[PDB]
Design a protein around this ligand. Structure first.
Ligand SMILES: Nc1nc2c(ncn2[C@@H]2O[C@H](COP(=O)(O)OP(=O)(O)O)[C@@H](O)[C@H]2O)c(=O)[nH]1
Ligand SMILES: [Mg+2]
Lengths: 187, 180
């Protein structure tokens, strides 16, 4: 019933907005805090009633120094990149995966592609085209999930809310596992 | 692979501033958580490992090592554990002034002079606090069987990302048929 979630990934990949949307059911259009803190989410996930604490983190450089304090006792990690940022995805296996395996060796990971609303957005496609890039594809996110050992890959849009609800339900399932896973152891 | 880182403080402050409230606040818150610290101074020392405790519900008496005291005398004593019983290893420590990253608790166990096991435990990043910390390892079981009973000797090391020796000590674990 009581579970701990930690959300990690590159600056500006949409972590805080995802947690705000899950929690308050509206995308923050003007003010957005660096971290959304102290929120326990009530989730029904079939059978139990879970209280899922949502622990947000950040970087922007020095918030680097505090992040480590976030991992004790986590039940489930959401590891994010944004679908408008091929760069964010390469950071998954390069940065976030070693960091989380180090601090949370056997905690389940949900790999999440955020900003799914941008995948056919015109300005995004133009901006990326000029670099000979394109939005991340679902196949890529699934294979990265495969590679790093994730429990699964999901996509969402905090902006439209599409897919958000399912992210937190799958994370809750993962955390329950875890426890368962755890147981286982180894040594 | 991882890484480391660290740084711081300032840073945170710055962050916170950024401014405030705003974011810053948140951042611061966160920071706070982390926290605080303490111281400043440085020296202390920043980290003072104060004790080891085997959390075992079945055990008729205490199973604690005061690590702020004399460490050699532990080699002339032992902890008796009945075969198969579950237990966790609680490492009591104080992070006084600075945030310590990637803390690790390592145990290399020996039987009749030779090393038969190596286990690393991820403790994590800990910021300064007036209140002591207690790190519990996952539930472990004492070994069972003819080839598993006997005297062991564990060389423990509480360390971190910069591979600092917060404390090193040797303690013994004698596995028996009954607590007696
Ligand atoms: N288009 C779009 N933008 C989003 C979405 N989620 C967040 N953003 C924007 O992306 C930027 C970074 O958001 P934020 O949640 O602060 O990311 P954090 O640094 O990972 O917490 C802000 O300008 C948000 O409005 C989304 O789902 N779609
Ligand atoms: Mg944020």
């Amino acid at each position: 019933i009581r579970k701990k979630l930690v959300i990690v990934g590159d600056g500006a990949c949409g972590k805080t907005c995802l947690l705000i949307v899950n929690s308050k059911d509206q995308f923050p259009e003007v003010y957005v805090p660096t971290v959304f803190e102290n929120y326990v989410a009530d989730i029904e996930v079939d059978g139990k009633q879970v209280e899922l604490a949502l622990w947000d983190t950040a970087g922007q450089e020095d918030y680097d120094r505090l992040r480590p304090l976030s991992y004790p006792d986590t039940d489930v990690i959401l590891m994010c990149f944004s679908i408008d940022s091929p760069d964010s995805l390469e950071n998954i296996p390069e940065k976030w995966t070693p960091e989380v395996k180090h601090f949370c060796p056997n905690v389940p990971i949900i790999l999440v592609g955020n900003k799914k609303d941008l995948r056919n957005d015109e300005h995004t496609r133009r901006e990326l085209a000029k670099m000979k890039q394109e939005p991340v594809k679902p196949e890529e996110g699934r294979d990265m999930a495969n590679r790093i050992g994730a429990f699964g890959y999901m996509e969402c849009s905090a902006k439209t809310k599409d897919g958000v609800r399912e992210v937190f339900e799958m994370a809750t399932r993962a955390a329950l596992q875890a426890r368962r896973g755890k147981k286982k152891s180894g040594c | 692979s991882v890484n480391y880182k660290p740084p711081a403080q300032k840073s945170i402050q710055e962050i916170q501033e950024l401014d405030k409230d705003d974011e810053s606040l948140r951042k611061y818150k966160e920071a706070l958580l982390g926290r605080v610290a303490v111281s400043a101074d440085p020296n202390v020392p920043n980290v003072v490992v104060t004790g080891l405790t085997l959390v075992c519900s079945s055990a008729p008496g205490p199973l604690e090592l005061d690590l702020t005291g004399d460490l050699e005398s532990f080699k002339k004593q032992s902890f008796v554990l009945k075969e198969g019983v579950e237990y966790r290893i609680k490492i009591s420590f104080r992070v006084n002034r600075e945030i310590v990253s990637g803390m690790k608790y390592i145990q290399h166990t020996y039987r009749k002079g030779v090393k038969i096991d190596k286990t690393d435990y991820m403790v994590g990043s800990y910021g300064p606090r007036a209140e002591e910390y207690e790190f519990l390892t996952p539930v472990e079981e004492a070994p069972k069987g003819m080839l598993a009973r006997g005297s062991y000797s564990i060389k423990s090391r509480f360390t971190d990302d910069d591979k600092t020796d917060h404390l090193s000590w040797e303690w013994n674990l004698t596995i028996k048929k009954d607590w007696k």
